[PDB]
Design a protein around this nucleic acid. Structure first.
Lengths: 94, 79, 96, 89, 90, 90, 85, 78
DNA sequence: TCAGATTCCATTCGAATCCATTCGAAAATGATTACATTCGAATCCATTCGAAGATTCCATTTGAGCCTGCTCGAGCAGGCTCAAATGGAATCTTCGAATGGATTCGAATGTAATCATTTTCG
DNA sequence: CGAAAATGATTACATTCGAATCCATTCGAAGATTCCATTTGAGCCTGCTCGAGCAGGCTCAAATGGAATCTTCGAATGGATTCGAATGTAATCATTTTCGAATGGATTCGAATGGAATCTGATG
C-alpha cells in the first residue's frame, strides 16, 4: 500500500509533465453538438472546430483550478471546496 | 445527459495538472456547470459567425474569432 | 531589395502593402513605417526563438515543438506579460 | 502567404543547428500576425487622435512604446531606429 | 429628412459620414447601415434616460444628475454588463 | 459637434416633465460615443472577415448581436429592422 | 460610518497631497511637466474607484477565511486572482 | 508624498467598500498598490503627451490612458 | 530489506523535415502630380506662483472589550486497491451534403453643383 | 431668442460590387468490428477538517492639541492654436524581373519495444 498523498503527488508530476488532452473526445463532441442544437438546427462541425473547442476548454479549466488551489491555501486547507471555485469566479468577474 | 460524459477521472486529471492535492466530493457538479456556461458562451458566438457567412458548417476560424472576442486568444488553429 | 537596404530578413514591401490595407478612410503610409515595423517583428521573433531553442537544447532535442515555445514564454516575465494566448500543445510549467 | 521563410531565416541566424516542426511554425505565424495587427491598430488610432492622415515611424514608435512592456520596448525602439537610420542613409 | 423618413430623432447623414470616416481601405457604406445605427443608438439612449428619470422622480426632484445615472445603471443587470465605465460624480 | 440636441429630444419624448444637468449631458455624450465606436469597429471586422468591401445593415445586425447582451439585443434588432423598413417603404 | 461613505459621491482624499504625489510620480518620465486641473481630477476619480473595488474584493477574501478583519494576505490574494500579481 | 495619503482617508475608502474592521498593516499595502497603479497610468499619459509634441498633460491623455488600461471613465470629455 | 516506480541504454523503422524545380504574382525602377506636412509669426488662453486665515481635518495616548490564534480530541470524508463491465479509438467503406470557383447580371454607391436647411455659438 | 458658415438633400450618371446559376470536389456523416484500456463500485483505513474552550493581542472610540487644506486675488508669462506659403513625399502608370508557393524526393530525427540499474517508499 501507499499512504494517502503519495500517488496524488505522482500524478501531479505526471500530468504537469505531459501535453496531451485529458478529456475523451467522443463525449466532448456529443456535448458540443447538444449545446449547439439550441442555436441552430442541422449544423455541421469541422473536426478542427471541435479540437479547438477542446483545447480552449481544457486550458480554461486548468487555470480555474489553479486559482481555486490558491483560494484553498488561503483558508489553511489542502482540500478544494465549491466555495473556493465560487470565490475565484467572483473575483474574476464571471 | 451528455455532460455526465465528463467523468470523475477526467476532472481529477484536470485538477492534478492544476496542482490540486485533495478534492471534495461536490467539485464535479460545480465543474460541469462552469464548463457548460463557458461552452454556451463560446458556441453562441461561433454560431453567430457562421450565420453571418450564410454557411451551414461551423469552421475553426469561427471558433478562433469567438474565443478572441471573449478575450481567450488561441494559437495553433489558424490566424 | 528594401529589406537588404535596411538590413533585415522580414519583407518591407509586403508589410507596407498590408499596412496600406489596414488604414481607416483614405490613409497613406510612409516607406519608413514599414522598415520600423519589420525591425520590430524580426526582433520579437528572434527573442522568442532564442529562448525556445535554449529550452530545446536543455532536453537534448534537435527540433522545436510547441512545448518548448510554452516553456520559453512562461519562463520569461516580459514574454509572459506580452503573450497571453493559449498554445495548442504546450502544457503547463511543473510546479508543486 | 505566410511568414515561414523569414522565421526560418531568423532561426538559422540565432540557432544554426536546430530545426522546427510544423505545429510550432503555425504557432509562430499566429504570434507574428497577432502582434502586427495590434501595432497597426494602435498606429491608426494615434494618427486619428492628432487629426492626421499619414502613418509614419513616429506613430509606430509611439505604438511600440504603448504596447510593449519594460525593456522589451526599449530594445525594440533601439532596433527600429537603427533599421530606419541604416535604410535612409 | 432621412431621420424623419426613418422615424427617428438621431441624425442619419451625420452618422453615415462618421461611418464612412472609419472604414479600412477604400470601403463603402450603405444608406441603411446608418438607419440601423441611428435606431440602435436612439433605443439605448431612451432606455438609459427612462431608468434615470424614474430614479429621479422617485427622489422627488425635477432634474437628472450623475448620481441618478449611476443608480439607474448599477440597478440594471443588462446595463451593468454593457456599461462598465466609471461615472464621474455618481 | 455633440449629441445634446438629440439626447434632449429623446428625453422630452420619454419624460416630458424632467430636465437634465450639464454633467449628466456630458456623461450621456460619452456613452453614445463609446457604443458607436464599438459597433463601428466590430462591423468593419465582420466585413473584412468575409472578403467584402461594403458595410450594410447585415454587418450592423451581426455586430449588435455580438456586442449587446440578450433581451437587450432583441429589442434593439427589432427597432433597427422597423426603422429600416419604414425608411425603405417611403 | 460604512453607510455614511457608501451613500455619498464625494472624493475621500485631500486634493493637495494627491496633486503632490501625482507630480512627483510624473517627474520620473519627463522633467518640466505641466498639468491641467482636469487631468488631476480625472486621475483622482479613477484611483478612488480602483481602491474601492479592490477593497470590496478584499472583504470577500476576508469573509472566505471566517474573519471580519482584513489583512494584507487578502489584498494579495485578490490581486493575484485579478491578474496584477 | 505617499505619506500624505493618510490613514483616515484609507479608512474612508475601506468603509465605502463595506469593510468592518481593518488591520494595522493595511495602510502601507494600500500605499504600495496605489503607487503601482498611478505609475502605470501616468506612463501612458506622458507617452500620449509626447507624441503630440506638448509640455502639458491634458485630460484627454488621461482618458485615453485609462481606456487603454481597461478602466474607462465617463465625464471628462470622454 | 523488499516490492514498485523511474530513468537510461540498444535497435529498427516510418513519420517528418530539409532540399531541389516551375511559375504566376508581386516588388523595384522611373517620372509626375498633387496632397499633406512643416516652418515662421501673432494673438491669446490657461498654468504656476505668492499671500492669508478660520477652520477643519489629522495625530497621539489610554483603555476596555472584542476578536483572532492555539491546543485537543472526535469523527468523517477522501484516498488507495481490486475485480468486473463498458465504451472509446481506430481503421476502412460508402454515401450524401455543401463549399468554393466562374460567368453573367442586375443593384447600388460615390462624385459634381446647387440649394435649403440646420446646428452651433453670441 | 437670432445669424450665419457648414452640410445634408436632390438629379444624374459610371462603374464597381455584390447576386444567381451551375459544376465539380472535398469533406463530413453514418455503419461496422473488434481488442483492450478506461471507468465503476465497493471496501478498508487513515489523516484532515471542524468545533469548543482558553489565552493573548490589538482595534475602535474619545479627548485634546495642532497643523495644513481650501478658497479667493492677482499679475506674469509661456505655450498651445491659427494663418499662410513652401517644400517633401506618397500614390499612380508601365515594364521587367525576382521571389515565394506548391510540388516531389532523400535522409533522419523522433517513437515504440526490451531489458537493466538505481531511487524511492514503507513496514519491520
Amino acid at each position: 500500500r501507499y499512504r494517502p498523498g503519495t500517488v496524488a503527488l505522482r500524478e501531479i508530476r505526471r500530468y504537469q509533465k505531459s501535453t496531451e488532452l485529458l478529456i475523451r473526445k467522443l463525449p466532448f463532441q456529443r456535448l458540443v453538438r447538444e449545446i449547439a442544437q439550441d442555436f441552430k438546427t442541422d449544423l455541421r462541425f469541422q473536426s478542427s472546430a471541435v479540437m479547438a473547442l477542446q483545447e480552449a476548454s481544457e486550458a480554461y479549466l486548468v487555470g480555474l483550478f489553479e486559482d481555486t488551489n490558491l483560494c484553498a491555501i488561503h483558508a489553511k486547507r489542502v482540500t478544494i471546496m465549491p466555495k473556493d471555485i465560487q470565490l475565484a469566479r467572483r473575483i474574476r468577474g464571471e | 445527459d451528455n455532460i455526465q460524459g465528463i467523468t470523475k477521472p477526467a476532472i481529477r486529471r484536470l485538477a492534478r495538472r492544476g496542482g490540486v492535492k485533495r478534492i471534495s466530493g461536490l467539485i464535479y457538479e460545480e465543474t460541469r456547470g462552469v464548463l457548460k456556461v463557458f461552452l454556451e458562451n463560446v458556441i453562441r458566438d461561433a454560431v453567430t459567425y457562421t450565420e453571418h457567412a450564410k454557411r451551414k458548417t461551423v469552421t475553426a476560424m469561427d471558433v478562433v474569432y469567438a474565443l478572441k472576442r471573449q478575450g481567450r486568444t488561441l494559437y495553433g488553429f489558424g490566424g | 531589395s528594401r529589406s537588404q537596404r535596411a538590413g533585415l530578413q522580414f519583407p518591407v514591401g509586403r508589410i507596407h502593402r498590408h499596412l496600406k490595407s489596414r488604414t481607416t478612410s483614405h490613409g497613406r503610409v510612409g516607406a519608413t513605417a514599414a522598415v520600423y515595423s519589420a525591425a520590430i517583428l524580426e526582433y520579437l521573433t528572434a527573442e522568442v526563438l532564442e529562448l525556445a531553442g535554449n529550452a530545446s537544447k536543455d532536453l537534448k532535442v534537435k527540433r522545436i515543438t510547441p512545448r518548448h515555445l510554452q516553456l520559453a514564454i512562461r519562463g520569461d516575465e516580459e514574454l509572459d506579460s506580452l503573450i497571453k494566448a493559449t498554445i495548442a500543445g504546450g502544457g503547463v510549467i511543473p510546479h508543486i | 502567404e505566410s511568414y515561414s521563410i523569414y522565421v526560418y531565416k531568423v532561426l538559422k541566424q540565432v540557432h544554426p543547428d536546430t530545426g522546427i516542426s510544423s505545429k510550432a511554425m503555425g504557432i509562430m505565424n499566429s504570434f507574428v500576425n497577432d502582434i502586427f495587427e495590434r501595432i497597426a491598430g494602435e498606429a491608426s488610432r494615434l494618427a486619428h487622435y492628432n487629426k492626421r492622415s499619414t502613418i509614419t515611424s513616429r506613430e509606430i514608435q509611439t505604438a511600440v512604446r504603448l504596447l510593449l512592456p519594460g525593456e522589451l520596448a526599449k530594445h525594440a525602439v533601439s532596433e527600429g531606429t537603427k533599421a530606419v537610420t541604416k535604410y535612409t542613409s
